[PDB]
Write a protein that binds this ligand. Structure first.
Ligand SMILES: CCC[C@@H](Cc1ccc(OC)c(CNC(=O)c2ccc(C(F)(F)F)cc2)c1)C(=O)O
Lengths: 246, 261
């Protein structure tokens, strides 16, 4: 048992590294100790950042969308490396990605966040929490709850090897609506959960019940996603091919 | 056997086939099974005249109604193609303006490539394969509507002789989207680097899938000139329609695609 699992963990770490350029380890190095990122903390600072790297709030939102669309392709590539994933019914793969990417985006965004701001543009920029929060409604309230989640998530002190398995657990959720064959999805998730548990026991022997605590974070994640989607709807009180891409 | 480099190309081929099946709900495989009688469950209702057309409805003017139907389907196809385009590695990382440009010039060449899958020399599948409208009925519509589809049929018959399957088409459609010689492109190099890779993958795919088909790769690439000619002829036909039929509406997505094409 405890060998297929080590294999699974290593396999997923290696694939996570290929798929996601900006790892947590590299993000934390930048957020602390070498060559500093460009800090966007103001309206004038944002203006200059676009030279270095509609009005203002709209351009920032549209930027997050371009990045999210990129991230969806990175996550999809990652998914296809999870053993058993490509052997699932194709409708079910599409369903799992459709309902999983938002949860994964915000999980991974926490790797680029501290309590004072978030890394952007592959770590070249840093947009402050206070700047994002100052944006006029409804655009001032879209990142804040991701910051509150991130602070709580980051207290677990997970590393990229832990996160690789956790992301996979998220993708293989058998409770997504419209799934046709739930059995093999839950069978794969069981194996991934086993791998995650062992990974966290070996990697974090002094953090009691880290496995449990990580799983409980799924509750705040789905909350964040549901309220985000409702903000996206409210956004409909504010180029044809361009809107098609998004 | 295969080597590391040709192995990466196979993975690319498989990724693109997989995304094609997820993005396009009516494949060539399904279209051929409907057209060739692999069926008591999948046979289409045939529209060959006005009364057939009437009877087909439970499933103004006839020429305009069919034309409005094509427009609508064209808008759907653009949505499907745009979703496919996102899956092509590197595409979403390109400059946003270039993504729009590649789609603008790409989508119709792709629409007509895939339309061939739904066609034989006698007609075309419609309404997700539930109906089949004859080439003769379409050709009989009052001018200039009777001219719209004939060039698509001529191309299709010649294109279908290549006997490409969906795994082949998936890489070819990607090659179409990622052309660095589209007008107005800001950053050509990254586009060409992606197409290089796509071309290598198409080439190997055609060698493996059709080993007895000499220069299929070259012959398929040559067909890109036919697609371009179809697009241009089609656009000149729409300008005539827009002027003779002041009461007919062209969808803004389609209008933006054609704007200064
Ligand atoms: C004016 C609209 C013409 C299109 C070109 C076009 C796009 C898609 C097409 O179908 C895949 C076609 C050919 N039309 C059909 O196959 C078709 C015909 C009738 C119907 C309908 F009757 F069901 F509506 C649906 C599709 C043309 C364009 O210029 O964008």
């Amino acid at each position: 048992e405890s060998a297929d699992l080590r294999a699974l963990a290593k396999h997923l770490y290696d694939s996570y590294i290929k798929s996601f350029p900006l790892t947590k380890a590299k993000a934390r190095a930048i957020l602390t100790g070498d060559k500093s990122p460009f800090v966007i903390y103001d309206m004038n600072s944002l203006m200059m950042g676009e030279d270095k790297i509609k009005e203002v709030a709209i351009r920032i939102f549209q930027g997050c969308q371009f990045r999210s669309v990129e991230a969806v392709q990175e996550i999809t590539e990652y998914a296809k490396s999870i053993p058993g994933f490509v052997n699932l019914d194709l409708n079910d793969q599409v369903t799992l990605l459709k309902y999983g990417v938002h949860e994964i985006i915000y999980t991974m965004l926490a790797s680029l966040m501290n309590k004072d701001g978030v890394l952007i543009s592959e770590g070249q920029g840093f947009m402050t929490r206070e700047f994002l929060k100052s944006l006029r409604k409804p655009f001032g309230d879209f990142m804040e709850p991701k910051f509150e989640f991130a602070v709580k998530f980051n207290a677990l002190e997970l590393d990229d090897s832990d996160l690789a398995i956790f992301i996979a657990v998220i993708i293989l959720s058998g409770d997504r609506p419209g799934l046709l064959n739930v059995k093999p999805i839950e069978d794969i998730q069981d194996n991934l959960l086993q791998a995650l548990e062992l990974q966290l026991k070996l990697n974090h022997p002094e953090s009691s019940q880290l496995f449990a605590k990580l799983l409980q974070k799924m509750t705040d994640l789905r909350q964040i996603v549901t309220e985000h989607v409702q903000l996206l709807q409210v956004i409909k009180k504010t180029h044809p091919l361009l809107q098609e891409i998004y």
